[PDB]
Amino acid sequence: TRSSRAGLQFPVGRVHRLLRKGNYAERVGAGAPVYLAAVLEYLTAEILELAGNAARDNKKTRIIPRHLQLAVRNDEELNKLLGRVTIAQGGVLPNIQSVLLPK
Amino acid sequence: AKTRSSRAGLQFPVGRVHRLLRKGNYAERVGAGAPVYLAAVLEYLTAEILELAGNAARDNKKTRIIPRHLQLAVRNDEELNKLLGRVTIAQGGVLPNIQSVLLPK
Amino acid sequence: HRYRPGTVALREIRRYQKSTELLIRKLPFQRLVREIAQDFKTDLRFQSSAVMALQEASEAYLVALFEDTNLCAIHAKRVTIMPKDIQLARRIRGERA
Amino acid sequence: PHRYRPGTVALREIRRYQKSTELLIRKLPFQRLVREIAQDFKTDLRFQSSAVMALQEASEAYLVALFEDTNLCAIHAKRVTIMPKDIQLARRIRGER
Amino acid sequence: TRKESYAIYVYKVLKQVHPDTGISSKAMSIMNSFVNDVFERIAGEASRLAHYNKRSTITSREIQTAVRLLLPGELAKHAVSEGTKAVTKYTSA
Amino acid sequence: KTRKESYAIYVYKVLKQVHPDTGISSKAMSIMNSFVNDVFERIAGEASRLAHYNKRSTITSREIQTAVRLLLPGELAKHAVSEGTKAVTKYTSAK
Amino acid sequence: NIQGITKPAIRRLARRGGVKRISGLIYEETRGVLKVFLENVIRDAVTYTEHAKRKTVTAMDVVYALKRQGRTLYGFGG
Amino acid sequence: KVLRDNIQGITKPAIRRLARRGGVKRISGLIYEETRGVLKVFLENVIRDAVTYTEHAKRKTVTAMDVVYALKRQGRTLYGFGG
DNA sequence: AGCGCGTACGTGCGTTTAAGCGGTGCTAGAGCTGTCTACGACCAATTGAGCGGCCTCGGCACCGGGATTCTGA
DNA sequence: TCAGAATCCCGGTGCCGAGGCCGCTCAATTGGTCGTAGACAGCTCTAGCACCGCTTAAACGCACGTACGCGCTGTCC
């Protein structure tokens, strides 16, 4: 393969086929799919870290879409990468404007 | 006629639009009507702005279209005002717009 | 007894922010979908997943909208959202003219 | 003597600056601000004089829009005077950070 | 050295449109920028369209639907009619 | 039936690397699959911008490196650039 | 089918949106708002259907249409 | 020569002229400072991307084009400078 | 800040239809195979397009004057 | 309300560097060639969906029940 030789789980050949057959350029230089697969794997781990932490804090073994949305909105840079983005079955952060009380 | 433009009824270069659709990495293969249709669309959209801009040049007592007239040429159409909403024209500025509560009573 | 007006709304906000369930009844939504689509093309089928996707985007858009809305109300010092807030909201987003 | 009233000349200034399109920040100070920002991102940059006027055209168009939207926030808050809070709401709503 | 520009075609169109009207180098400039943006918008959505249909080839079909996705409704009608006339005229000519 | 692809298995593998004793739902699986394809498209579209903007008919690891600094926020970008470079470091050394 | 978007469904959406108090004109406003929104997505979605030579408007047809207009929903083959 | 405080070279009348083009009748004194803030955040965004295109181009001259690319990334497309 | 008008709220009871289970219509969603048009690649040709040119015209600049109208008595 | 000056508007003349249209050169665009595989076509099998219907069981709707908000009217700073 190429994944064990790069130190990756993610499929380098799948990523490279999409770089050529996605029409992004004439030619694609063979470090590109390994550097890209590593970034996709890193970002995958960065979501799953905070989503696994959320699943544990929500007392669950299985990651549901709630845990993905909460992980993405708990972190500024995930929310900045994912600002226009929205998640199926995700909900919102708990937030009430502090003027709203029984009084 | 030799030029693809003439065969099409266009001023816009069907050859260069062809070259660019190839150089620009959009698909493997390019059709032959794709340029002609796109060149007519570019020629239309440019003629739309140039019409409204020549009218705005006349509204400025001007013989030369300057960017003030191009901004009017976008903003005087409800629809070009949408297409070029999130676009800035150098020296286009803003139309005169003063809010009704600010004016003296 | 009687809960003071506004007390249970706070309770309900907590309930709905905590939950990720869909808030529009899916058959009334789906019938309005097919109407709006009908307007575009006749004799159209829709995947169940296709409807959901419209559903999820529509519900999430309105919540964020209401988010932003409620802000425009409190900017006027109001608690009550009014059509002017939405209007200003959209306006600023540049959706509406 | 003569003295125009508070808020008479203000609209004469709006009318003046909306009839014209030339930029409203000075060129040498704006270029020095671009040098100053750019130096902290990468030392020993060079700038095409056209590039800086781009940045200025882009920035003054940005802020006029902004102001635009800020004035609406003050008006919606029943105010003739813009304040940091209007700006703040505007940006929030625009999705700015 | 050869810097390519739509300056001449924009002149011809402007002269059909307002024969007694010139264009400033800034005005021009702007218009030439708009040509490349409209080209990139339509070719990008036609490339999406291609892609989305497991299709190897951008045809005026693509370009047509892309113009319908991109342009607002009255602007779309006129862009479409110039497109459909031009292809029909080209291949028969 | 279609042999429809997904990143399912590799996302699972990576979940084990961060949280060994944790699992994932189908609903969540999709959204992770979705996230990968969207980020792939946003980075490859920027690498295609770098290719066009620099004449070269080619996307290299450098076009990816810059596309990653363009797309991602600063600390996310720093980490992604480190992992991208580290993966290439083992890889180009191997045959 | 506009009143099928129920008054309590709008109350639920507004309460999730952090709203204690809803003015009576909001319910019809939210319906106009939502109609416009669905309009926009269904228009571009159909367009992809039209282009696909299909009678089933697909999920992908909707996902492309959302993803054109900002509003990037993940989960439906993203 | 070192560079310092050139943000205050964005002047009170320059900020006022812009708010007047923006249709503003009355300016609270606290706006002027806020404005600078926003503008700094603004220019930082665009210049970081433009410099990132200049860096990738193996150049040190930030070009009209690099500016123009950055804006278009930021959804602020600009005509008059190329592209 | 005060002063006045009346709207959203929360709560008991009365009224509707969505959830979701269920199904056959009849498909048309998606798959796959052999044909030929069409496009990429090509060759070789002279045009089409661009930058160098050159001159003033349409613009911008300076100055006097009338026109508008705000604000002072 | 008349009275004045202030800034706006305008008319001119006046001076000139930017653009309108021409030119002449070279690589881009075109005239007619190939080879090849895309796509059309068009037939196949068959999820998946259509939208109708039903029994159920919550949710919708309505009137109710009263409180706290909207927002104008005033005044000071």
From Swiss-Prot, chain C:
Coiled coil: none annotated. Transmembrane segments: none annotated. Acetylation is generally linked to gene activation. Acetylation at Lys-84 (H3K122ac) by EP300/p300 plays a central role in chromatin structure: localizes at the surface of the histone octamer and stimulates transcription, possibly by promoting nucleosome instability. H3R2me2a is present at the 3' of genes regardless of their transcription state and is enriched on inactive promoters, while it is absent on active promoters. The modification N6-glutaryllysine is found at residues 18, 41, 77, 84. The modification N6-(2-hydroxyisobutyryl)lysine is found at residues 18, 26, 41, 84. Its main location: nucleus. GO terms for cellular component: nucleoplasm; nucleosome. The modification N6,N6,N6-trimethyllysine is found at residues 18, 41. The modification N6-lactoyllysine is found at residues 18, 41. Keywords: Acetylation, ADP-ribosylation, Chromosome, Citrullination, DNA-binding, Hydroxylation, Lipoprotein, Methylation, Nucleosome core, Nucleus, Palmitate, Phosphoprotein, Ubl conjugation. The modification N6,N6-dimethyllysine is found at residue 41. The modification Phosphothreonine is found at residues 42, 69. The keyword Ubl conjugation applies. The modification N6-methyllysine is found at residues 18, 26, 41, 84. The modification Phosphotyrosine is found at residue 3. The modification N6-crotonyllysine is found at residue 18. GO terms for molecular function: DNA binding; protein heterodimerization activity; structural constituent of chromatin. A lipid is attached at residue 72 (S-palmitoyl cysteine). The nucleosome is a histone octamer containing two molecules each of H2A, H2B, H3 and H4 assembled in one H3-H4 heterotetramer and two H2A-H2B heterodimers. The octamer wraps approximately 147 bp of DNA. This is Histone H3.2.
From Swiss-Prot, chain D:
The modification N6,N6,N6-trimethyllysine is found at residues 19, 42. The keyword Oxidoreductase does not apply. Acetylation is generally linked to gene activation. Acetylation at Lys-85 (H3K122ac) by EP300/p300 plays a central role in chromatin structure: localizes at the surface of the histone octamer and stimulates transcription, possibly by promoting nucleosome instability. The modification Phosphotyrosine is found at residue 4. Core component of nucleosome. Nucleosomes wrap and compact DNA into chromatin, limiting DNA accessibility to the cellular machineries which require DNA as a template. Histones thereby play a central role in transcription regulation, DNA repair, DNA replication and chromosomal stability. DNA accessibility is regulated via a complex set of post-translational modifications of histones, also called histone code, and nucleosome remodeling. The nucleosome is a histone octamer containing two molecules each of H2A, H2B, H3 and H4 assembled in one H3-H4 heterotetramer and two H2A-H2B heterodimers. The octamer wraps approximately 147 bp of DNA. This is Histone H3.2. It comes from Xenopus laevis (African clawed frog). The lineage of its organism: Eukaryota, Metazoa, Chordata, Craniata, Vertebrata.
UniProtKB/Swiss-Prot annotation, chain E:
Keywords: Acetylation, Chromosome, DNA-binding, Glycoprotein, Isopeptide bond, Nucleosome core, Nucleus, Phosphoprotein, Ubl conjugation. It is found in: Nucleus; Chromosome. GO terms for cellular component: nucleosome; nucleus. There is a cross-link at residue 89 (Glycyl lysine isopeptide (Lys-Gly) (interchain with G-Cter in ubiquitin)). The keyword Magnesium does not apply. GO terms for molecular function: DNA binding; protein heterodimerization activity; structural constituent of chromatin. Signal peptide: none annotated. Monoubiquitination of Lys-89 by BRE1 gives a specific tag for epigenetic transcriptional activation and is also prerequisite for histone H3 'Lys-4' and 'Lys-79' methylation. It comes from the Eukaryota. Glycans are attached at residue 81. The nucleosome is a histone octamer containing two molecules each of H2A, H2B, H3 and H4 assembled in one H3-H4 heterotetramer and two H2A-H2B heterodimers. The octamer wraps approximately 147 bp of DNA. Belongs to the histone H2B family. Core component of nucleosome. Nucleosomes wrap and compact DNA into chromatin, limiting DNA accessibility to the cellular machineries which require DNA as a template. Histones thereby play a central role in transcription regulation, DNA repair, DNA replication and chromosomal stability. DNA accessibility is regulated via a complex set of post-translational modifications of histones, also called histone code, and nucleosome remodeling. This is Histone H2B 1.1. The lineage of its organism: Eukaryota, Metazoa, Chordata, Craniata, Vertebrata. The chain holds residues 33 to 125 of 126 of the full protein.
From Swiss-Prot, chain G:
The modification N6-glutaryllysine is found at residues 7, 35, 53, 55, 67. Keywords: Acetylation, Chromosome, Citrullination, DNA-binding, Hydroxylation, Isopeptide bond, Methylation, Nucleosome core, Nucleus, Phosphoprotein, Ubl conjugation. It is found in: Nucleus; Chromosome. It comes from the Eukaryota. Transmembrane segments: none annotated. The modification Phosphotyrosine is found at residues 27, 64. There is a cross-link at residue 7 (Glycyl lysine isopeptide (Lys-Gly) (interchain with G-Cter in UFM1)). The modification N6-acetyllysine is found at residues 7, 35, 55, 67. The modification N6-butyryllysine is found at residues 7, 20, 53, 55, 67. The modification Phosphoserine is found at residue 23. The modification N6-lactoyllysine is found at residues 7, 53, 67. There is a cross-link at residue 67 (Glycyl lysine isopeptide (Lys-Gly) (interchain with G-Cter in ubiquitin)). The modification N6-(2-hydroxyisobutyryl)lysine is found at residues 7, 20, 35, 53, 55, 67. GO terms for biological process: nucleosome assembly. One of its GO terms (molecular function) is structural constituent of chromatin. Demethylation is performed by JMJD6. Signal peptide: none annotated. One of its GO terms (cellular component) is nucleosome. Core component of nucleosome. Nucleosomes wrap and compact DNA into chromatin, limiting DNA accessibility to the cellular machineries which require DNA as a template. Histones thereby play a central role in transcription regulation, DNA repair, DNA replication and chromosomal stability. DNA accessibility is regulated via a complex set of post-translational modifications of histones, also called histone code, and nucleosome remodeling. This is Histone H4. The chain holds residues 26 to 103 of 103 of the full protein.
